[PDB]
Write a protein that binds this ligand. Structure first.
Ligand SMILES: *[C@@H]1O[C@H](CO)[C@@H](O[C@@H]2O[C@H](CO)[C@@H](O)[C@H](O)[C@H]2NC(C)=O)[C@H](O)[C@H]1NC(C)=O
Ligand SMILES: *[C@@H]1O[C@H](CO)[C@@H](O[C@@H]2O[C@H](CO)[C@@H](O)[C@H](O)[C@H]2NC(C)=O)[C@H](O)[C@H]1NC(C)=O
Ligand SMILES: *[C@@H]1O[C@H](CO)[C@@H](O[C@@H]2O[C@H](CO)[C@@H](O)[C@H](O)[C@H]2NC(C)=O)[C@H](O)[C@H]1NC(C)=O
Ligand SMILES: *[C@@H]1O[C@H](CO)[C@@H](O[C@@H]2O[C@H](CO)[C@@H](O)[C@H](O)[C@H]2NC(C)=O)[C@H](O)[C@H]1NC(C)=O
Ligand SMILES: *[C@@H]1O[C@H](CO)[C@@H](O[C@@H]2O[C@H](CO)[C@@H](O)[C@H](O)[C@H]2NC(C)=O)[C@H](O)[C@H]1NC(C)=O
Ligand SMILES: *[C@@H]1O[C@H](CO)[C@@H](O)[C@H](O)[C@H]1NC(C)=O
Ligand SMILES: *[C@@H]1O[C@H](CO)[C@@H](O)[C@H](O)[C@H]1NC(C)=O
Lengths: 146, 49, 37, 97, 146
């Protein structure tokens, strides 16, 4: 009976260890051999890479991740009216520091002038809730004028 | 020591249950809370807040 | 405070300042209202 | 006969607080609170981010905002009614107990 | 023996419950704290968000997802010839309602005129199988003419 108890405990603990080993193999495949979009799977933050290290009866992953550091407030707007046309950002968000409007990335404050390259138009300015009035620069205009 | 190891197994199970609850729910560092205004762009969260 | 020795039903205990054993309700974390508008 | 039940460490109120914190973070900051500090963003713009994330341009969200809000509210109401009508809904938890 | 049977059953059921709890923790991390690209992991459809709710001995996820609703038939084409050059869509699919050709998104019918901004050229028109003849509008031409 003592031997049977030991063997049953060993079987249950071996099943648990096998689950842990399958998780470790998945983390090796996804965190180390690639970059993972799954949240909190390869560490807290936006995953950049991972490095494996061996250990007695286990593995240790060093997860290198990207964490935003210093946030600042800005006044935002879903879209922008220039000539009765609503302009939406191609990749970024419209922000304002109080007087002027820029379009920036969503994870790093890098303001840029709002031009027709950063934005695309869709419809008139009677549907979007919270739209604002600002000028959208046209790169071709000075070249044509020159 | 059959009784002692039965007791040990049950204690381990109980601690594991507490750990399960902690892992599932305690994923947030700070206890956030919504502002007193409840206009989230027309969406109505009053039944889950 | 953070839970040190879990007693149960939200009550934990620790050894803190003479020094003695204190029982308390565990702390989930610092509250933080997000400035949403 | 010596068979007793120990109470869980986290009371139901603490679990409710945890879920409330997760919900408030999700509503007021999107997914940003899961990476670092919670960064506030208007909910319509967050939903436009999600629409971009599923491959739909955000002008679809901005031009159908009221319709999407109404659909979400109706779905939440139907969840309410389904929970309040059918008693045999939480089968798994009751099976565990 | 009765006690040993009870404890063994409890150990097996606790392993099952721990597997379920790990799954729930993963769903909390990915569905709630982020947006998941994994199919049918956070509900049926294209995942938008998720909301957690507590329950006795468990959790309940309200998965908000996006489901296409009203589909319409269109005549499609892999590419388009304008001047002996094959034009492919940057982000979208070429569709036709019977007489005219447009380029649209792949998940929401929003037809647009086929211009050089929506498309990119690659090679001649002798390799693509199923290519069609249509005009690709050049935005700079009227500006130059004006
Ligand atoms: C918001 O940003 C704009 C653009 O950087 C600022 O405008 C410039 O401000 C500097 C002063 O630091 C001047 O030297 C430039 O001539 C300004 N440029 C233009 C085009 O006006 C603006 O001052 C910022 N507003 C605030 C409140 O900081
Ligand atoms: C953005 O600019 C447009 C036009 O420059 C404004 O539209 C005008 O609104 C006033 C007041 O409602 C009307 O009397 C005019 O007839 C409108 N003009 C046009 C061309 O539509 C619009 O109000 C501005 N937006 C904001 C928020 O001030
Ligand atoms: C969000 O939904 C709740 C319930 O679906 C709404 O609360 C109802 O409001 C109406 C009118 O004020 C009352 O007649 C009902 O009795 C309320 N029901 C409950 C359960 O409170 C709430 O009004 C909705 N939010 C908004 C902004 O309309
Ligand atoms: C396919 O779509 C095109 C573009 O919308 C249609 O062409 C327009 O049709 C309307 C009639 O509803 C006319 O008023 C416009 O003048 C047409 N525009 C052009 C540039 O010709 C076309 O009719 C559609 N074909 C079918 C079979 O529905
Ligand atoms: C698309 O247009 C091109 C040219 O406008 C067509 O190519 C012609 O095909 C005929 C018949 O095979 C030849 O006699 C001509 O010499 C070709 N011209 C050129 C410039 O290559 C092509 O056939 C058209 N595609 C379809 C499906 O009709
Ligand atoms: C943004 O403004 C609010 C206004 O109270 C403030 O509480 C918050 O700290 C500001 N955000 C940052 C990053 O300073
Ligand atoms: C497309 O045409 C086929 C032709 O039989 C038809 O069966 C199908 O229902 C059509 N699709 C839609 C969305 O109507």
């Amino acid at each position: 009976q003592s031997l049977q108890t030991y063997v049953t405990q060993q079987l249950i603990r071996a099943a648990e260890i096998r689950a842990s080993a399958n998780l470790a193999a998945t983390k090796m495949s996804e965190c180390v051999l690639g970059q993972s979009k799954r949240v909190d799977f390869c560490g807290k933050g936006y995953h950049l890479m991972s490095f494996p290290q061996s250990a007695p009866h286990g593995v240790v992953f060093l997860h290198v991740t990207y964490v935003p550091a210093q946030e600042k407030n800005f006044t935002t707007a879903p879209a922008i009216c220039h000539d009765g046309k609503a302009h939406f950002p191609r990749e970024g968000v419209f922000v304002s520091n109080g007087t002027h409007w820029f379009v920036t990335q969503r994870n790093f404050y890098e303001p840029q002038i709002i031009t027709t390259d950063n934005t695309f138009v869709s419809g008139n300015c009677d549907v979007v809730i919270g739209i604002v009035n600002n000028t959208v620069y046209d790169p071709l205009q000075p070249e044509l004028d020159s | 020591s059959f009784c002692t190891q039965l007791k040990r197994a049950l204690t381990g199970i109980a601690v594991e249950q507490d750990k399960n609850t902690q892992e599932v729910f305690a994923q947030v560092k700070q206890i956030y809370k919504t502002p007193p205004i409840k206009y989230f762009g027309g969406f109505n969260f009053s039944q889950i807040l | 405070y953070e839970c040190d020795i879990p007693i149960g039903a939200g009550i934990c205990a620790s050894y803190q300042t003479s020094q003695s054993i204190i029982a308390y309700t565990m702390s989930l974390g610092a509250e933080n209202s997000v400035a949403y508008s | 006969n010596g068979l007793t039940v120990l109470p869980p460490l986290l009371t139901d109120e603490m679990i409710a607080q945890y879920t409330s914190a997760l919900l408030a973070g999700t509503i007021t900051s999107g997914w940003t609170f899961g990476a670092g500090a919670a960064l506030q963003i208007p909910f319509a713009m967050q939903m436009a981010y999600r629409f971009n994330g599923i491959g739909v341009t955000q002008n679809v969200l901005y031009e159908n905002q009221k319709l999407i809000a109404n659909q979400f509210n109706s779905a939440i109401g139907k969840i309410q009614d389904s929970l309040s009508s059918t008693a045999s809904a939480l089968g798994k938890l009751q099976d565990v107990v």
